[PDB]
Amino acid sequence: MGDILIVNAKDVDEMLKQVEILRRLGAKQIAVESSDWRILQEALKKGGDILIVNGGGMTITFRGDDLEALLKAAIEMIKQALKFGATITLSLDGNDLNINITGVPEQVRKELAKEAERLAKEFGITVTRTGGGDVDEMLKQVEILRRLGAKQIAVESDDWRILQE
Amino acid sequence: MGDILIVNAKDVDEMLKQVEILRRLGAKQIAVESSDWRILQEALKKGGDILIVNGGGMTITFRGDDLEALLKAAIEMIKQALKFGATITLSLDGNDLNINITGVPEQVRKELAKEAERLAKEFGITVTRTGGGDVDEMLKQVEILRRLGAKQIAVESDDWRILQEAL
Ligand SMILES: [Ca+2]
């Protein structure tokens, strides 16, 4: 119970179902959090009171057809990231193994980014990471939500010291 | 740049630093999110406008002295959790290896919990559930936040089909 109920969903249909359950129970302030801009745009059109943007950390994505190679490189990334005190968030989306690193300064996210490149070609997979270009993309997608008529938008980050830059 | 800025921190000092940076940049609505109740209580005393409770999924914690045994138990938990489509969040805090599992229904959180118990025996470490599946404890900690003077509280979950009992 609380003043604001936040639905965290990576599936757009499951997001709608939980918003309907909370709205039918009388919840006045339902928020929807997702790293998927389409889920946030769908929550705006279907009943979301607040839209929460996930703009924290750095996401490393290993891609490959051999699952015993994506995990092999992900485990070494986890072991080294935990040794720096980072928080690691993993999900497997098709052939994409997404790894989000939070809780470490920008100097350590680059160390892990350079190790991810070394782990990619060492196991024959591909690596991609997020950068400053995603910040510009974030402000643009936020303005697309404002122009679609979003009244309350929240932006979440683990490090507002670098994000202000 | 949005109406609400949310500080997600697991370190109390880093939380205070980022709230101070945003307040001096003119942010009118600063929120603080943490799975640590003390960080939420410290953000309330700092002047946080919104406290976000993490009430989603299930948190299992491996404890032990051999780090390459907390890891290997965590690695096997990741392998099976990914086979269910789950999102896995890990952090290493002292001798505690915290594993949070979201995006899966109640029957899968139970099965992974029983596998964590089976993996703790195979590697000689201890596993406990340090979060999730205890709505009364969550509600009581929320009521401690109101009585300390929290005027805006947010509760976050990936599974309101089960958490609707809190309402
Ligand atoms: Ca959140």
The beta-carbon neighbor of B157 closest among A8, A86, A103 is A8
Contact A152, A43 (CB under 8 A): no
The beta-carbon neighbor of A2 closest among B6, B33, B142 is B142
- Residue B146 to residues A159, B44, B46: CA-CA distances in angstroms? 27, 10, 15
Residue A6 to residue A18: CA distance in whole angstroms: 10
Residue A34 to residue B85: CA distance in whole angstroms: 16
Residues of A in contact with B56 (CB under 8 A): 8
Backbone angles phi, psi at B88, to 5 degrees: -120, 130
Q: Name the helix (H) or strand (E) containing B53.
A: strand B50-54
Question: Between chain A and chain B, how many beta carbons pairs sit less than 8 Å apart?
Answer: 147
CB-proximal residues (5 Å) to ion ligand 1:
A 33
Q: In chain B, what's the furthest Cα-to-Cα distance?
A: 53
A97 DSSP 8-state letter:
E
CA distance B110 to chain A (A): 19
Backbone angles phi, psi at A85, to 5 degrees: 80, 15
Backbone torsion region of residue B120, taken as left when φ is above 0, otherwise alpha when ψ lies between -120 and 50, otherwise beta: alpha
DSSP code string of B81-135 = HHHTT-EEEEEEETTEEEEEEESS-HHHHHHHHHHHHHHHHHHT-EEEEEESS-H
**Are the beta carbons of B155 and A5 separated by less than 8 Å?**
yes
Tokens, residue A112: 């892990």
Q: Name the helix (H) or strand (E) containing B167.
A: none
Residue A132 to residue A27: CA distance in whole angstroms: 37
**Are the beta carbons of A25 and B158 separated by less than 8 Å?**
no
Residue A100 to residue A130: CA distance in whole angstroms: 10
Contact B25, A164 (CB under 8 A): yes
Q: What amino acid occupies position A137?
A: E
Backbone angles phi, psi at A58, to 5 degrees: -130, 135
The beta-carbon neighbor of A3 closest among B9, B154, B158 is B154
Residue in B with minimal Cα distance to A71: B79
The beta-carbon neighbor of B6 closest among A17, A91, A154 is A154
**Are the beta carbons of A164 and B89 separated by less than 8 Å?**
no
Question: Can you name the residues that pair with A126 across neighbouring β-strands?
Answer: A63
Backbone angles phi, psi at A89, to 5 degrees: -120, 125
Contact A34, A17 (CB under 8 A): no
To test the contact with chain B by mutation, choose from A77, A87, A137 the residue with the greatest count of B C-beta atoms within 10 A, namely: A87
From A54, A78, A88, A70, select the one nearest A128 (Cα to Cα). A70
Residue A105 to residue B124: CA distance in whole angstroms: 34
Question: Can you name the residues that pair with B25 across neighbouring β-strands?
Answer: none
Q: What amino acid occupies position A94?
A: G
Question: Quick one: B38 exposed, middle or buried, by C-beta within 10 A (0-12, 13-18, 19+)?
Answer: exposed
Residue B150 to residue A122: CA distance in whole angstroms: 51
From A122, A143, A135, select the one nearest A59 (Cα to Cα). A135
Residue B73 to residue B77: CA distance in whole angstroms: 6
CA dihedral B12, B17, B18, B19 (to 10 degrees): 80
